[PDB]
Amino acid sequence: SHMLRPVETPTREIKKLDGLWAFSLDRENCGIDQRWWESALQESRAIAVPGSFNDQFADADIRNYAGNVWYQREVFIPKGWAGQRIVLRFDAVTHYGKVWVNNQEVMEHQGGYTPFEADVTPYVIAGKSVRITVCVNNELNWQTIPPGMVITDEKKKQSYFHDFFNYAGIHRSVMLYTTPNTWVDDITVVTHVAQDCNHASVDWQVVANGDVSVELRDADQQVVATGQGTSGTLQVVNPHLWQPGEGYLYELCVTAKSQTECDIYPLRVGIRSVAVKGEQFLINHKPFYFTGFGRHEDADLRGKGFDNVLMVHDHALMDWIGANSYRTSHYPYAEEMLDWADEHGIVVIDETAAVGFNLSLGNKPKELYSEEAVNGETQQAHLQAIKELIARDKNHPSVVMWSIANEPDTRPQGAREYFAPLAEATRKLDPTRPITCVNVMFCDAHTDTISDLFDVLCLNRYYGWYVQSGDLETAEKVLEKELLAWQEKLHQPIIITEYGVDTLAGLHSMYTDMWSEEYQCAWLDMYHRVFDRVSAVVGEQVWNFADFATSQGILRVGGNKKGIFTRDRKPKSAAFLLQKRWTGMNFGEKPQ
């Protein structure tokens, strides 16, 4: 469970395994039987790690593959790591990985978007080359997060219920890292902030197999507070709060000392509180207004693979357009993104991979919550996905809210019985952040059965698109009516976590009609006018930052075209509309 982000210290080294690996499909599904991990993969080819495997090859038969694929490389253990605790770590393997070091099985993970690792000290020798084999499986069933159904025809075909392509592979960094045989295994900080903002407290809890001391250092490396033992509270006079748009960070240096060994782990800490009060979202006791995007991890060639240039360029576009926030739609993002948000003061709604709990979007069993679909084991798997997300992200000050799912069908019998325990367990795992369950349009104010269990109303709305098609005048009436009915029903802060229309870049129309750039601008504008008239709306996240790949079908013109930007990051007209609205408002303040 304990999952600290590897960082280089006087007591910790890292060796990235990113680069070219050997790669092989297993159409006969005989690689486990033939123990492929005991040899060089036969009939293999070069693949980039990190990256989705699907689009690296310009090959439809690989892109559409369902089953196991195999990655392998050789790596030299640094000579100096003799006597040291050596960990092998995968930041993310989509959706399942099993790992062998030479002929030793070392670890296994279900969940495509959070890290897994094993201590491999006993199975490697410092100064020698070792063989790493990974069996990666991209199949979804009713107990995976997200769910799906594999149909077999004779040949496997993956069915799934979410509007983004089922990219798979080693999407994020692989690495070896070291600790001493005494080490800091875990840290929780809780950051309290007086109402007047003129004092703050920092609770710590540490797990380590040796005596623990902590030093809190400011941005200038001046020690502002010190403590001892596994737990306690640091007092901070006149603290530099972590504020949206700035993101001042302290460093909590955790030392675990044995008589013989010592370990130093620096954790970035942003001093901020988050709370809902009535229909206001407060950060450091001040109302905040969310602007920005639903995103995806999606790009040409690399699929959902992490990439620094893309992270730099996309943050430069969000900065320029005046976005203050985003949501990790619809899975945990690369941790680098949360390190970025921490440092630049970007506000994040951190979401699990639990999209698709919904059989009514655009074969399938009769009852959504039943033994044959979302069941007891599904709910366990969902709890595990929430635990892994919070265990990874609990200390990121940029994360202001947990979204435990996107667009579940809450009409059917058993929805509330499924969600209640998940809402409760989320609050116990992290009491410091509000929780949400992002709401599908047809589960309206008069229909939805679970919104009372959550703190903030995150509504996905597309009136004037899938319904009242091309009619802004009717869409505006229906939208305003529904937001006010939500305000009346629950008196929670409302974030519109999804509003957008498919827009084909370069399609221009004097009739302002669907798919045109001019429609995208008129439709976003109508939404904005309505949001500004409703006092409960504390945010707006446009769907989507950029055009992204989907499953093939008649609704998707080479993918999802709701982007503000093209997949190659070129702006549509609507990017300039958002630039003016979001840079023209006062930072973090509801427009008028």
User: Judged by CB under 6 A, how many residues of this single chain contact ligand 8I4?
Assistant: 9
- Residue 44 CB, nearest approach to a second copy (Å): 12
Active-site annotation, residues: 407, 498
- Order across the sheet with 14-16: list the strands: 14-16, 174-179, 85-90, 116-119
Determine if residue 64 is labeled as part of a ligand binding site. no
Subset of residues 79 to 118 that bind a second copy, contact rule: CB under 8 A: 79-82
HEC letters along 280-326: EEEECCEECCEEEEECCCCECCCECCCCHHHHHHHHHHHHHHCCCEE
Told to check if 403 binds ligand 8I4 by CB under 6 A, we report no
User: Judged by CB under 8 A, how many residues of this single chain contact a second copy?
Assistant: 47
User: What type of residue sits at position 203?
Assistant: D
- Residue 420 CB, nearest approach to ligand 8I4 (Å): 22
Told to check if 335 binds ligand 8I4 by CB under 6 A, we report no
Binding partner of residue 272 among a second copy, ligand 8I4, none, CB cut-off 5 to 8 Å per kind? none
Instruction: Report the residue number, 311 or 585, with the smaller CB distance to a second copy.
Output: 311
Distance CA 97, CA 46 (A): 19
Taking only Cα atoms into account, the Rg of the chain, rounded to an integer number of angstroms, comes to: 24
Instruction: Report the residue number, 378 or 403, with the smaller CB distance to ligand 8I4.
Output: 403
The distance from CA 480 to its chain's CA centroid, rounded to whole angstroms, is 30
β-bridge mates for residue 438, sequence order: 406
Subset of residues 312 to 341 that bind a second copy, contact rule: CB under 8 A: 312-313, 315-317, 320, 340
- Residue 562 CB, nearest approach to ligand 8I4 (Å): 5
Instruction: Report the residue number, 49 or 216, with the smaller CB distance to a second copy.
Output: 49
Told to check if 455 binds ligand 8I4 by CB under 6 A, we report no
Subset of residues 15 to 34 that bind a second copy, contact rule: CB under 8 A: 15-16, 19-20
β-bridge mates for residue 178, sequence order: 86
Binding partner of residue 308 among ligand 8I4, a second copy, none, CB cut-off 5 to 8 Å per kind? a second copy
C-alpha torsion 10→11→12→13, nearest 10? 60
Classify strands 68-76 and 85-90 as parallel, antiparallel or unpaired: unpaired
Instruction: Tell which one of 2, 39, 59, 376 touches a second copy (CB under 8 A).
Output: 59
Told to check if 51 binds a second copy by CB under 8 A, we report yes
Instruction: Tell which one of 114, 325, 460, 503 touches ligand 8I4 (CB under 6 A).
Output: 460
Binding partner of residue 163 among a second copy, ligand 8I4, none, CB cut-off 5 to 8 Å per kind? ligand 8I4
Told to check if 547 binds ligand 8I4 by CB under 6 A, we report no
Distances in Å between the Cα of 53 and the Cα atoms of 47, 60, 68 are 7, 11, 12
Binding partner of residue 194 among a second copy, ligand 8I4, none, CB cut-off 5 to 8 Å per kind? none
Distance CA 181, CA 11 (A): 10
Distance CA 146, CA 162 (A): 8
Nearest in space to 5 (alpha carbons), one of 415, 309, 340, 365: 340
Of the ranges 41-49, 107-115, 184-192, 524-532, which one interacts with a second copy (CB under 8 A)? 41-49
Told to check if 301 binds a second copy by CB under 8 A, we report yes
Instruction: Report the residue number, 410 or 503, with the smaller CB distance to a second copy.
Output: 503
Instruction: Report the residue number, 31 or 147, with the smaller CB distance to ligand 8I4.
Output: 147
Determine if residue 61 is labeled as part of a ligand binding site. no
Distance CA 175, CA 277 (A): 43
Told to check if 407 binds ligand 8I4 by CB under 6 A, we report yes
Instruction: Tell which one of 57, 365, 421, 469 touches a second copy (CB under 8 A).
Output: 57
Distance CA 538, CA 528 (A): 12
Told to check if 13 binds a second copy by CB under 8 A, we report yes
Residue where the block lists tokens 């310009």: 58
Told to check if 560 binds ligand 8I4 by CB under 6 A, we report yes
Nearest in space to 442 (alpha carbons), one of 419, 469, 412, 422: 412
Told to check if 302 binds a second copy by CB under 8 A, we report yes
Determine if residue 498 is labeled as part of a ligand binding site. yes
Confirm if 263 and 184 have CB atoms less than 8 A apart.
yes
Distance CA 470, CA 519 (A): 8
Could you tell me the two tokens for 153?
């025809």
Told to check if 48 binds a second copy by CB under 8 A, we report yes
Helix axes 517-533, 573-584, angle to 10 degrees: 20
Nearest in space to 17 (alpha carbons), one of 174, 128, 193, 160: 174
Which residues are annotated binding-site positions for D-glucuronate?
Answer: 163, 406, 460, 466, 498, 543, 562
Give residues in contact with ligand 8I4 (CB under 6 A): 163, 330, 406-407, 460, 498, 543, 560, 562
Give residues in contact with a second copy (CB under 8 A): 8-10, 13, 15-16, 19-20, 46-49, 51, 55-59, 75-76, 78-82, 127-129, 300-302, 305, 307-313, 315-317, 320, 340, 567-569
